[PDB]
Amino acid sequence: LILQPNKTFACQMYNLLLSYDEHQSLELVPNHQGLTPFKLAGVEGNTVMFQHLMQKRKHVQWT
Amino acid sequence: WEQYRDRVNMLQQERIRDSPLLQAAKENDLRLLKILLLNQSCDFQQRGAVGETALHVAALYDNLEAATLLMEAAPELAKEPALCEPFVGQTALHIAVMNQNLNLVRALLARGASVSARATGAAFRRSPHNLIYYGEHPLSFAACVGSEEIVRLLIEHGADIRAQDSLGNTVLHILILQPNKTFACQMYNLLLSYDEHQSLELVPNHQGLTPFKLAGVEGNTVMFQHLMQKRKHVQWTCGPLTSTLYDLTEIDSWGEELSFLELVVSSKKREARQILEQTPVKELVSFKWKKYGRPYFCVLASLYILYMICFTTCCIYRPLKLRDDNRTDPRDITILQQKLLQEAYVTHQDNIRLVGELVTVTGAVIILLLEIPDIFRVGASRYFGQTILGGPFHVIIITYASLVLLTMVMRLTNMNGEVVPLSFALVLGWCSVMYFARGFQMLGPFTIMIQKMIFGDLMRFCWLMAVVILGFASAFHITFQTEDPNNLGEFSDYPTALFSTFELFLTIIDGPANYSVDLPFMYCITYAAFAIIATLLMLNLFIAMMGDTHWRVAQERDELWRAQVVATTVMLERKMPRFLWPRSGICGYEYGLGDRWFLRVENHHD
């Protein structure tokens, strides 16, 4: 789903996969190359997918 | 260093997370917070990492209900500020004003929290590290973020209007220091609706700047126009055209030494040159330049051109005499040497040269008497580094005067080697005539983009160029260290091997080619590669870089030419006789309107 040509809407459908990922996790399993999906989004230049991945890791501590 | 602020912020999160009361104030949950209000075993006056109370946290996270809960549980807790290094005086009322919480600010002023509290910490003072400069006062914060009801509630609850911080800026200065937000102009009107009895408009900071002068130096054009909606008034109109008079009392600033236009044109900020095109500023300096600035600048330009003519015809005819010891040396050129001073002035032509020598020495004296107080009055880094005020030319003219005075030192000591100060003075001084080329509208910004190329392109490209001519010069030297220096002596020793490779980089000197001898076979290989990488590739790339910076200047030619003529107009406003430079504008004391000088311009709109 990362390897698409920068389509926005499957971004939300990425959430659907992470809506149903349960018990490692699907986010940490590598391929035969040995790449995390975060690393695949990094190497393929999917910036929208990268920003959507960094919505979950970050949190605001104060404003 | 900014990692300390990250450590303080996550240590604040540590002290919030450890304490159950501060965690309950952050999370906005009232359930355990009721028991925290009820029991007397817990301490409500506990400190954070800095000094933030739980009411500080509840003001920080827009938690007004928990703040009011411990504020009934502790009414005296609101007045204590933070007490560590980044927040040495931050109250929660500053945070509640900054977050625009109307009910929390109304409750905080209803319970008598301090309104004149100064938050003089390092985070609130201006810096490149802090992203905002909202000030140190609650009235400052309320006007500066742009909330009307909060600042009017602060006026009705105390908060005297004059509030100078550690930098000395009042409210109007740091309303002007915003990044060009329009609506704060209307907020400025609110402050000028509530300014009464000097006035707030005239009080300076620790730098000694009016808010008008701070608007001029910071480039805030919208505030500058908004300030001159109050100063101007139309005196008559007919048809499409109105005639209006502008007050130049704080523009020309006749009483004050350090003038307003000197603060505009010598500003380090880039955006302070778009404020120099405004509707009474362009006309005032255009009247100064056309009526006075161009004729006195042109006669000074002709006088300096004649001074350099009288200097170059003085030094072309300099004393040299035939040497007594014969040459007797191969690879040498010498006919004649320098002349001693006892026979340097013996004929009438020597006296005609000598009066020119005294002209040049007194020219050096009147140059250094017009630069040393001028470099002392504004500082070294302010005046030499500013490209608008002719600083690169003003170090060159100073270097000329020091070099010809060093010539005057050397000649009376009768020692040789005087070709070098005449050569440096004669190359630097005729390039300083470009300093007088800023006046003409035809040939003005050419001399600013020449110095722009010198300090932008050929500061970066010379380090990329001195790693090619060094390596290729060393490569050419080794291929001709084995050979002779007679048949092909362009790389005989290493200084001329550097200089010939430099000249071959510039394609001035022809390629080293002697077809009557067998050249080394490595030389053709390492010179063909030189002709690829250096004459073809790096030279014309740097020509294209000159074309790009020439385009970059040529889109904005008039914006720098007007700044150049403002700089030289306010330079000839100073250092010149007062009877020859009368006050620009018309007087108006005989017109009964006061002892203020004005400028009438007329426009043409629909």
Place this chain on the structure above:
Amino acid sequence: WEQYRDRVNMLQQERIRDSPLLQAAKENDLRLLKILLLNQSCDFQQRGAVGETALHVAALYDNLEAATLLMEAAPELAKEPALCEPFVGQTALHIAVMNQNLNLVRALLARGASVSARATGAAFRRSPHNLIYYGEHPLSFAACVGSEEIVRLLIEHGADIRAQDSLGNTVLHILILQPNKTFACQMYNLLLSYDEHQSLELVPNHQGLTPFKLAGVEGNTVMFQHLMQKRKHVQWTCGPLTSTLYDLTEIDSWGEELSFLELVVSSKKREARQILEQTPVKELVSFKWKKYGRPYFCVLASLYILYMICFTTCCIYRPLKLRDDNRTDPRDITILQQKLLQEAYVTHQDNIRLVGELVTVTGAVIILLLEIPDIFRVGASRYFGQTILGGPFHVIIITYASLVLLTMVMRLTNMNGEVVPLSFALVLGWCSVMYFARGFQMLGPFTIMIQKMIFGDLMRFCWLMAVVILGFASAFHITFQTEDPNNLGEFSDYPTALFSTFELFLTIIDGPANYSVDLPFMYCITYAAFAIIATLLMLNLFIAMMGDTHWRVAQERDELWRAQVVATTVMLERKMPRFLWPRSGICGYEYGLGDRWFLRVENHHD
């Protein structure tokens, strides 16, 4: 000088402010103004600083009620105008018309104020100082500001339509002189609604221009299109395509000497070349150029090329003979000298040269017979300074004819030094063939951008060249006054030190480098700096500057090529036989439509 007008304007404000009546008329307050009407001690005919009455003030500040109250106080006060220098004849009816007050203008014409009053002040005459040129008449002001009901009210209240000012312009001329406003075009129809019995369209000014010719010379393209809606009519249409005939009676202007197109192409205003692309002008001069202009211009271009070939093969074979005395001089070149006229024509080849000499002399005669009446008929600054009409080439051809006539003068006096005027004539005349290069569509505007760069770029860059080659030439000279002029004599004396530094600036002559002798150590330092600042920096900045100027021309290539072919088409329209240049357009006298010549064009629209 414009400061006098500022002094007059605030002196007007002084005379308003001192008088209570004028202040009451300015402020629009009736309370003390009623007492000012009642008492007879005050004088209602008091003057301003110029002559502005209270009615003038109340008309100037849009105060109709106080104006009408003082007209009931004084009905005779309206007819008196101002009487000082900037407002020589300004009435307040001009001001009320200009401010578009319908009720005030109706009251002023109801009380019998003058409608034919000429406002002959310096503020109303056209100048760069005055921002508007609205005219001198009330009908002029009403038709010029853009009001319909006011101008029709002025038609019904007198105001004869023909109204020539001190410049002699009528209403239509100074309705054309607006900055291209569309709606006034329709109000031109309003003037053409009330023009009756010559007509108003044909009356000239003091310059001698028809209003159609004024629209031609001022570049008012929208008014030109509106004027040629009236002249043209469609004769048939089918499908998408219409055929319409345009009247060229005032385009060609066969009766008048100074033609319409001569006023268009020799206009000082830049915007008068976009009117030259219009639908009845472009087809007419394209028919003139294709049918007649290009063949006669090409045969004149071939005749001038053959004349210069017959001149250069005449002056290459010039009389030259071996000198009688021997040289006996080092640093000298001379083999042969000039030849005396008694032996300059002795052989048949000398006669073949001699008939070419008479060809060149009669060519100079027929050149100066085609330029001296032509420079007398339009003036010196009109014709030499205009770049469209080949003025830079027409000073060059005149310089050719004067130089070869001076060569013929010098040859018959048998004195030497004829190499110099022959050399200037021979170099200037082959550059004048670019004058014949304006005709071809391929290589046309290259010759206009070459002269554009000569007069634009290299008049500003020559002064920035002469502060570098002078300083560096003088710096190179001092390093080689000490040394010998044999091993490195490129800076021996100061004229060749200027010329060699100029050539080293231009990168033509190779760098002065003699590796078989020890050069001065300052020379390499001050020449490395020269190769940086001049060959690398200063030159290619000017090369990219020429590239930007070439881009500026090349965005507008066809707009200048069409102007060039219009200029040479109307220049070959004059100075040429009438039987060889028949009248363009078709006659229409045999078609019974009148003695007016027309041009039929067909178009293709949806």
